[PDB]
Symmetry: C3
Subunit: 233 residues, 3 copies
C-alpha cells in the first residue's frame, strides 16, 4: 500500500479577483456575486479533494504498519499454540507419572509394613529359640564330659550297663527261691577256728556246725543284699 | 486519530445558476452552454470531493478502532508469553523431580525385594531350628527331670555308676577261678544242722555235710549270678 | 464494508473552452485567462476528487480484510488464555503431589533402613543358634537310639538303675561288716561229696571242716568283690 500520489495536491490558479478584472455593464448583479462565489467555490472544493486525498494516503499508511503487527501477532499466537499444545502433553505426561509412582509407593508401604510385622515375629521366635537352646545346654547329659553330671531321676537302659568297655550289669537273674532265716550282720573271719578231736572222748563237734550255720546266715546276708538291689529277683 | 474535518463537507457558498441571471445577447451560444455545463460540473465535483473525504474519514475511524484492539491483542499476547514461559520452567522442574523420585523409588523397590527374600529365607531357617530343637527336647537325657528315663540302648560309663551320691558299681573284679558242679536256687533256711550227741551219731554228722553241700552249691549259684551280669571275672 | 461507489468517477461534460467562443470584445484579457484557468482547474480537481475516492476505497477494502484477521486473532487469543489457566491449576497441583510423595518416600527409606539393621542382626542369631544346636546334636545321649552309648564321665543317678525296665541296682545296702581273712576266688570243687561211715573216722571229719574253711573263704571273696563295687557297705 501507501500510494504517494494521493498526498500530492492539485494546484489551482491563485487568482481570486473581482471588479478589478470584471466587465462593466453586461450581466446581472446576481451573476456578479455568482461568478465571484464561483471562484471561491472552486477554491474551497479543490482543498476538499486535497484534504480527502491526504486523508486517504494517511489511512493506507496506518494500514501498512497495522499489517506488520497483525503479521507479527499471527507469528506469536502461532508459536504460543505450539507451546501450549506441547505443554498439555507434558502436564498430562507428568500427572500420569505422579499417579504411577503413587501406586508403587502405596504398594511398597503395605510391603514394608508386613515386613516390619514379620521381622517382629522372627525376633520373638528366635528368642525362645535361644532360650530353649540355653535350657538344653544346662542339663543334657553329655558324651564327652569328663566330670560326673548326676541326674535326679531313675535310669533304665536296654541290654546292660557297662564300665570301661566291660559289662557289669545285665537283666535280672531269675529262677530263685529266696532264703529264709536270720541274716549275719557282724564279725566274721574266714580263717579257721575249729577242727577236731584226734581220737576224741571230748565231743565238742558243735564248732564245725556252729560255724556252718553262720556261713549260711551270712550267705542269707549276701544273697538278700543282691535281691534287694534287684541283681536277682 | 480520525481527522474531524474530512467529514466536514465544503459548504458551497453560492446559489444555483439558472439562465435568467445570464447576460443574454452578450454571450456566445457556446459560452451559454459552457457556463451551464461548467455549472453542474462544479457541483458534481464538490459532491464527489465531499464523499472522498467521507470514505477516508471512515477508513480512519475504523483505523482507530482497529488500533485499540491491536493494542489489546498486543498486551494479552505479551501476558500469555510471560505465563507460558513461567509454565515451561515449572513443567520442566516437575518432571526432573519426578524422574528423581523414580530413582529412589526403584532403589527402594529393589531393596524391599531383597528383604522379602532374606526374610523368607529367615523363616525357613527358624522353622527348621524350632523343629530339631523340639526333637532335641524330646529325646535327650537331662540331669534335672524327676521321672525315670529309659535309654532304649545299652549304656557305657567311665569309672563307675553311683546312686544318691555313692558308688555302687565299678570295673569288673578280675581274676576269679570259676567254680564247678551244678548250682541250684531252691529253698534254703537257717537249718537246725545241729542236734549233737553225747555219743557221736552218724545220721547227725551227715546232716552237717548235707547242709554243707547245699551251701557251696548256693554260693556258686551266686557266683554264676555275678559273672552272668559281669560284676565278676 | 468498503463502499464500492467510492470508485465511480465524475466525468466533466463541459467542453474544453475554445477562446473563439469567448466574448473578447467584452472580456478583459485578465478575466480571459482567469476563465481559461478555471475550466482547467475544474477538470483537474475532478481527477483529484476521483483519485481520493478510489484511494479511500483501497483503504476500506483493506480495513475489511484486517477486520476478518482481527477477530480470528481474538478468537485464538481467547482460547490460548483458556488453555493456560487450565494448565495453571494442573501444574500447581502436580507440584503439590510431587513434594507430598517425597515425605512419603523419605519416611519409607528410614523404615527400610531400620529393617535392614534388624534382619542382618537376625541372620546372626540364627547362625549362632544353628551352630549351637548342631553342637548339641553330636553330644547328647539319645533317649531313643538303638546302638549303644558311651559316657566318659562317671554317672550318678537318683534311686536306681534298671535294664529292660526292671530294677537292678539301688541303694548300696549299709550297716555291713567286712569279713576278715584270706578270700579265695581259686578252684571250687564240683560240689564234691565227703564220705561217711560207721564209726568216727578223723579223716572223714577233717574233710568237711576243711571244705568248710574254703567255703567261708570264697564267701568272703564274694563279699569283698561286692564292697569294692559299692553294692554293700
Amino acid at each position: 500500500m501507501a500510494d504517494p500520489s494521493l498526498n500530492n495536491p492539485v494546484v489551482i490558479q491563485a487568482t481570486r479577483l473581482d471588479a478589478s478584472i470584471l466587465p462593466r455593464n453586461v450581466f446581472s448583479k446576481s451573476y456578479l456575486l455568482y461568478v465571484i462565489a464561483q471562484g471561491t467555490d472552486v477554491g474551497a472544493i479543490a482543498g476538499k479533494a486535497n484534504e480527502a486525498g491526504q486523508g486517504a494516503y494517511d489511512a493506507q499508511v496506518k494500514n501498512d504498519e497495522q499489517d506488520v503487527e497483525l503479521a507479527d501477532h499471527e507469528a506469536r499466537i502461532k508459536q504460543l499454540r505450539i507451546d501450549v499444545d506441547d505443554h498439555e502433553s507434558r502436564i498430562t505426561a507428568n500427572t500420569k507419572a505422579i499417579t504411577a509412582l503413587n501406586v508403587r509407593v502405596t504398594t511398597a508401604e503395605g510391603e514394608i509394613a508386613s515386613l516390619q510385622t514379620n521381622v517382629s515375629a522372627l525376633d520373638g521366635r528366635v528368642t525362645t529359640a535361644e532360650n530353649n537352646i540355653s535350657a538344653l545346654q544346662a542339663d543334657y547329659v553329655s558324651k564327652t564330659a569328663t566330670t560326673s553330671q548326676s541326674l535326679a531321676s531313675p535310669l533304665n537302659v536296654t541290654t546292660s550297663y557297662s564300665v570301661g568297655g566291660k559289662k557289669v550289669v545285665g537283666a535280672r537273674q531269675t529262677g530263685w527261691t529266696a532264703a529264709t532265716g536270720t541274716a549275719n550282720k557282724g564279725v566274721f573271719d574266714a580263717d579257721l577256728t575249729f577242727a577236731v578231736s584226734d581220737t576224741y572222748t571230748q565231743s565238742e563237734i558243735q564248732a564245725i556246725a556252729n560255724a556252718l550255720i553262720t556261713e549260711r546266715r551270712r550267705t542269707k546276708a549276701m544273697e538278700d543284699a543282691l535281691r534287694a538291689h534287684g541283681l536277682i529277683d
